[PDB]
Symmetry: C3
Subunit: 154 residues, 3 copies
């Protein structure tokens, strides 16, 4: 009976959907995702901010955004090098916004940062933000190439 | 049409099964799984034994258990810090057993361990086991938080 | 009812295909795949050449093959020790060919190599090639055990 075959096939599909969910949980776990916390991951490739945005979007994620000390340390450890954060004041100078919307709240600026430097020689000031090796932040040219770190929901 | 469509769906489902199996194989390989050998994975999160057990269970794995010096070495390599092992004397004080059942066939106890110590203030003695930095074992409170290391079959 | 169910099943299968593709993209990213570049992966296990071939084949990949300095560097960094490349002169002594077919177009041989040395006592000369610690190449016995590094398309 076609109905029986259809029913058995629906069961197979459900089994596969659960298997894939497990595959995703195992991968996240293997990559360091902590229980109930956002998942941060990188391919260790350095690229301009525009590229990071496109890459994370393709993966259905967003550019890493630290919203507290814990998340900051987590991203720092993942990146292990200067990486772009999803924060920018491209629109209005001095008004840093999350790529996901909203004005900047938590921050971990290095002393004297942000300074919107123009002397880097790339044109424009510094409208992007990078978390440096020590975990502190520094505004940088969005044209510069820093590590791509994407984040996925908790 | 209906029957031809249903027949294609079977092929679609079968093909997806094979692709997901291949995905799992590649993932195990990327996580360092050696041919015909079980493998260990961690997200580097520290939590109480009960949480590790539930977490590994959810991944269809088990809390890491060393059956020989090689596996013990592999687990410490994966963990990097003190991690719980799937061995406890919760059923009968003094008699350590595998969470998977049965008595120990291999041990690597640290000198003067196990000691079922109470001075840790967590209440009760020590019924769980952790592999320490240098591969040796120590019994610790199951309430204590140590690294979660899951094991997957060979 | 039957046709609506078949239509939903087609939709379920397509969503599953879509999610698996996303899972594969995320996995490659997490394993260091650089944008538009072929990627190399290893489980850090050492084995004879025939085993590496069988293994990478099972993963629907191929034994790593550098076609230029950049790829050679990438493989070197992934393996971090001597590893077999998909290059051999088994078909015609002295003529190194890619396992994927065709004569070498890029080479990075160490000084005095290849030498089809017999002194290893394994039998036969040296018909396989490994990339050594510094990125240079040496022909070695296909029967020797070196790191398995698989390659997947860009
Ligand atoms: C990597 C880094 O910190 N770069 C900063 C640059 O952004 C700008 O602030 C400049 C001002 O002199 O100082 C540099 O140290
Ligand atoms: C982490 C560790 O080793 N803890 C042990 C504890 O389990 C208990 O054995 C105590 C006895 O005095 O000694 C401690 O060093
Ligand atoms: C691992 C390695 O480099 N082996 C080489 C071997 O292939 C052969 O060339 C021999 C010549 O005497 O030298 C060895 O060092
Ligand atoms: Ca500006
Ligand atoms: Ca600015
Ligand atoms: Ca700055
Ligand atoms: Ca089709
Ligand atoms: Ca005890
Ligand atoms: Ca103890
Ligand atoms: Ca549904
Ligand atoms: Ca030869
Ligand atoms: Ca040689
Ligand atoms: Cl206990
Ligand atoms: Cl040979």
């Amino acid at each position: 009976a076609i109905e029986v075959k259809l029913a058995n096939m629906e069961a197979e599909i459900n089994t596969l959907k659960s298997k894939l969910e497990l595959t995703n949980k195992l991968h996240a776990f293997s990559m360091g995702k902590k229980s109930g916390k956002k998942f941060f991951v990188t391919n260790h490739e350095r690229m301009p901010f525009s590229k990071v945005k496109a890459l994370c979007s393709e993966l259905r994620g967003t550019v890493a955004i630290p919203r507290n000390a814990e998340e900051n340390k987590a991203i720092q450890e993942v990146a292990k090098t200067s990486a772009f954060l999803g924060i920018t004041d491209e629109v209005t100078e001095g008004q840093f916004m999350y790529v996901t919307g909203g004005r900047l709240t938590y921050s971990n600026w290095k002393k004297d940062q942000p300074d919107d430097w123009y002397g880097h020689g790339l044109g424009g000031g510094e409208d992007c933000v990078t978390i440096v090796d020590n975990g502190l932040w520094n505004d940088i040219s969005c044209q510069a190439s820093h590590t791509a770190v994407c984040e996925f929901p908790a």
